[PDB]
Design a protein around this ligand. Structure first.
Ligand SMILES: *[C@@H]1O[C@H](CO)[C@@H](O[C@@H]2O[C@H](CO)[C@@H](O)[C@H](O)[C@H]2NC(C)=O)[C@H](O)[C@H]1NC(C)=O
Ligand SMILES: CCCCCCCCCCCCCCCCCC(=O)O
Ligand SMILES: *[C@@H]1O[C@H](CO)[C@@H](O)[C@H](O)[C@H]1NC(C)=O
Lengths: 49, 49
């Protein structure tokens, strides 16, 4: 509860130097896919289809 | 101009091998398909091969 009044003010007499962390992702892993290897791995009939 | 992903490095087979068990005898084709008597269908005979 803030002690509000029409003629009262609160003024700081000191200060705190505070250091905080913010962590942000920037990049993800780059991937490549060989379709023939994934679907028809070393099968000539599957590769031809 | 640039760098392009190609297919993964393929190695072709050099020879074909076949590995079957040490089996000598022929299956009893004469006993199965040339039996003198055959069972009735209600009492059908089962033979292990
Ligand atoms: C303002 O705040 C600082 C730190 O919050 C006060 O410094 C401390 O003062 C006490 C008492 O003199 C010491 O025991 C601490 O070692 C001090 N800390 C540091 C980091 O210096 C300072 O006294 C405050 N000033 C006023 C006017 O309130
Ligand atoms: C004597 C029992 C043999 C058991 C063999 C088990 C493996 C199955 C292979 C096929 C055997 C029967 C093939 C029949 C040949 C048919 C020829 C035709 O089309 O006239
Ligand atoms: C089938 O059985 C008959 C009667 O025993 C025989 O004459 C014939 O040679 C047999 N055939 C084969 C392929 O074994």
């Amino acid at each position: 509860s803030v002690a509000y009044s029409n003629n009262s003010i609160a003024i700081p007499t000191n200060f705190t130097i505070s250091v905080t962390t913010e962590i942000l992702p920037v990049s993800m892993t780059k991937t490549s896919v060989d379709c023939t290897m994934y679907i028809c791995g070393d099968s000539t009939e599957c590769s031809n289809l | 101009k640039g760098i392009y992903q190609t297919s993964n490095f393929r190695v072709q087979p050099t020879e074909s091998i076949v590995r079957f068990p040490n089996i000598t005898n022929l299956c009893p084709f004469g006993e199965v398909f040339n039996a003198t008597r055959f069972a009735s269908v209600y009492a059908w005979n089962r033979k292990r091969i």
